[PDB]
């Protein structure tokens, strides 16, 4: 069902499609729905081979690796496959502005960063869409989440949970965020960390 | 945001069906050698390294994580990546995620150190050359008289 | 006068020719030395001596494999520690061990990260307090009013040492991760629920005298962790010092005074050798050069005189080693 | 006359040392003033543009905006005044010495507590004022001659990003997505306008002109007596909106039933944030991060001509010549400044 | 346009620590680069010339030459590339980061065994190359990206003192008074030229522009792409030569001295061609403007520097990517540099 909804959302906000465009879009949605939870590189390669075999068997196209598919609406008026270097330059300038405006952090932009912020973007563009980011510390999780939320015009709420805090303070923070979201229509991105539980 | 998947509390979050059914799981994991190489190449492209002779080594392809080695910078990046892997192997981290924090911090320290060291080296050499020229000129003047 | 000046400067000419010859080798080994020192600084802070040696072996294997020349006689203290730093640290009360010198150099050369001090003997609190004098402010995560005192210290610009590091309070995560906001010519950080100004004269040290404590994964990956654990050399040195102090304090005082005076003399000699070259480079001369030369010979003569006691102390050391070993 | 449309290629290309943050046109002579992220300030003759006429580094950080004015003294000698605001938390006033072709600083204005982001200059009978907004959420009014402040009001919750001045009224956009019109001398808010989903980048009045033009002609005799009806805004929302201002109770007073704007038209077609807007006759020009300049028809609300890939990077600012004023003759030229450290000039 | 002539006084006066040995001009911005005997490199803003934009001790001995280039990639971001050679036996390749107004050392070129004299830069479709000559009588060619040499040859029994590059052909002037043209990629001598009685100081091609010598004579020369060249030596004489067409992998034969300019009181140091005229500095503290058509001196800037006048720079007028601005800079032995604008 998630794959179906993703395909519909991409088509409804996309340009005139062709068969190759449709197949690449379907492959990108399959990647995001299925293979983002995979841990090992071996499993990812097996999934790529599975995609190739499925396309050959049922739907007889370029290279459909994870980094070879870059669909985004950040560079145009509609969801479409974008070029890598244009996205890199756009993200670099946007991040310069973001550092100058919110928090100065010397971040170096690489390809996996671009991919991760693209998928965080597609997740925050949905309705009732939430994230669970899993990775080593100091891999840019919170920074990228804040950057993408800033791009989409969300309001960031990091709970100020510290030592000597209890259920009342967390409840107050949650109630405040909920009340803002409802009575003030403040679209909010709540960042809950494992150290806050 | 989850740093340690195997914690007592974080595994409870990942297991919790209320969260697991609504959330979208994005297993960022840790950095691969390609991301490491890109970051290192970007950081060490502003420091004076290629100021000396360099004979390109002959090493196995799987030991090379960058493009084929042509200059000192590629050697430095490969060395840093290799040492990071070896250090995390010896310290017996196991399967626990490896933060790239040591790698990044080492890169920044290397830049900040190479700059000053190179500047000091050339300034001292210039001072020595000027002193030698002064002594030779004085000797020539003495021989004149 | 000219001939005498040339004859006096013949030694400087010899040194300068030697330096000119060594320039190529120094430039060839520069990058390898810098790589080794940086890795030593960012990885070896939380390893004992054996692990440091093994990792140096691995790193030197890697450097040799990729054709990056380095100093075969490399030594961290020689490369990254100056005489002034050694004198200041020793006067502040640091132990005389080489391991403590390396760890202090690691701690004092971290302008970006916050040094975390695992010091079970609580010696480094006193050492740092002596180093920074009046600026030092002592706090701990286990007290009340901690947040307000920290805000006052940040605003004013004190040097802060927070004890009980195993009880980290995440209310200072912005200070830990250096997530500031620049407001024109002002720098603001959000501690608690309100922004404060960062003076720029403000440093942070986290101290904990509890090995096998607990460091949250947020804090561990953002601090420079340094261990101050006693080793064989420190125990032997302390035992010998106590034995000599309780046996014959005259030799003890004489040895200490000679050591300190010799260190001062070598520092002054280095300063003179630098100043002579600067005087030549900034061009009267025939007078200042001779004055500096005479001062250099006087200091060298005093240093040569001061070396007539060291054999006695070596004999004394050989006479007392069994106590240290046992 | 006024239906001049620029051609497909610029007639000049100016190279500078940093990103161009603001550009301006001399209202009398063929001269262009250019600002950069280094805080420099250039001046290029429009026929020999390979060397600047003069340069000046007065600020220590990036210049954010600038504006010019040719003084019209009715009984003194006229000259050109240039005002630049930067992230130095300061505003510097310059005088352009034409015969020697040099800049001449006059004074600096202090008092803002954070990044100043806009300035404006206008002249009354024989008075000159300066308006400025900054991140401290304060809009200040200054006296050109005395040099000290005359008013200071805070009309927004977020920080004000842009302003415009028409007589005694100042309309301001902010980092919050809301517009607001206040009466300057009394410092009282009059009406607000919402509808944008991203911070406001530009905002300015649509001055009345004699001719027919859709939004440049009054609707009631009350508007004729009040002198203005419509305003235009640009935001990071990739949209340009035309608003119609409600009439206040003339010192004015906010009518509670009529204290909100009314977006009468929304222009879409840009691919990214819209950075600047300018109005000439029946056309509205705009530049955006998509490396392009649009030209909209005010009557039908359509995009008549597109200038794709004019710059290799973001297009920071435009500048056309004011046409609604009699003292400024609307010459046929416009200038664009971009992130690629280049400025294009269209002539004739 | 191309007929601009400098005024009788310099618009700017720049003071440095030591004798100025080489001066270059930023192709796009009003910035001048200065190198001295102390190995220090300077970048001066042409409107605030009391403090350098940046400064840098690049070498440990005197700098002997330098050259600049604005890269033009058809795919990457373009930037200015600065290359300097000194008596350190090393060549340093810098990069001008206009965003921060500072230098950026990229790499260094090594292999010459004794003091280097001159350097050159040029760009192919997407390839950037460097050239050099030294007292060890070797001419080396380098790849700007990889950094290692691509060609080496010895075109003179004595040591080369000046070179210039045009396509695939390089002409070198030695301490021995003979010039010589060689074919770069294959390293084949094509012809020589004699007639000077003192060591050469400079040599450069004359490029075809749309003038007496800048226009091809025959169709075969048009196909070849060059006909003439100029050189100046301690003979106090500037000579315009003619390159005999080779046996076109070219195969080899004498340079015909079809003109000679005299009048300088000392050694002619540097030359530069701007459209019709020709500019030349010399040790007699003078700068001369020579009409290429008549071959006669037009204007003289006497007593420009107290000491020798070392080098001149003018914007290239024959390149589609270098707009020929109206300015020139003169570097002198007296720790001063003169700038003429408009
Ligand atoms: N691409 C990168 N370049 C530089 N530093 C990076 C990069 N990615 C992560 N970091 C480092 O990670 C930290 C910021 O990431 P952050 O989101 O705060 O970490 P996490 O969310 O994993 O706890 C900084 O220390 C920063 O230097």
Residue numbers in the entry:
A (entry chain A): 2623 to 2682, 2686 to 2822
B (entry chain A): 2890 to 3034
C (entry chain A): 3291 to 3573, 3582 to 3624
D (entry chain C): 139 to 213, 216 to 351, 354 to 392, 397 to 494
E (entry chain B): 139 to 213, 216 to 350, 355 to 392, 397 to 400, 405 to 494
What does the article say, verbatim?
Cytoplasmic dynein-1 (dynein) is a minus-end-directed microtubule motor that is conserved in many eukaryotes. Structurally, Lis1 is a dimer of two ß-propellers, and Lis1 dimerization is required for its function in vivo.
To enrich our sample for complexes containing two Lis1 ß-propellers bound to dynein, we used a construct of the yeast dynein motor domain containing a Walker B mutation in AAA3 (E2488Q; herein referred to as dyneinE2488Q) that prevents the hydrolysis of ATP as our previous work showed that this state results in Lis1 binding at both sitering and sitestalk. We also added ATP and vanadate to our samples as this is converted to ADP-vanadate, referred to here as ADP-Vi, which mimics a post-hydrolysis state for dynein. In our structure, dyneinE2488Q’s AAA ring is ‘closed,’ which is seen when dynein’s microtubule binding domain is in its low-affinity state, the linker is bent, and when two Lis1 ß-propellers interact with dynein. Binding of Lis1 at sitering primarily involves the smaller face of the ß-propeller in Lis1 and an alpha helix in AAA4 of dyneinE2488Q. Our high-resolution structure also allowed us to unambiguously map an additional interaction between dyneinE2488Q and Lis1 at sitering that involves a contact with a loop in AAA5. Lis1 binds to dynein at sitestalk using its side and makes interactions with coiled-coil 1 (CC1) of dynein’s stalk, as well as a previously unknown contact with a loop in AAA4 (residues 2935–2942). As suggested by the continuous density in our previous low-resolution structure, the Lis1s bound at sitering and sitestalk directly interact with each other. While our map shows ADP bound at AAA4, we were unable to resolve whether ATP or ADP-vanadate was bound at AAA1-AAA3 and chose to model ATP into each binding pocket.
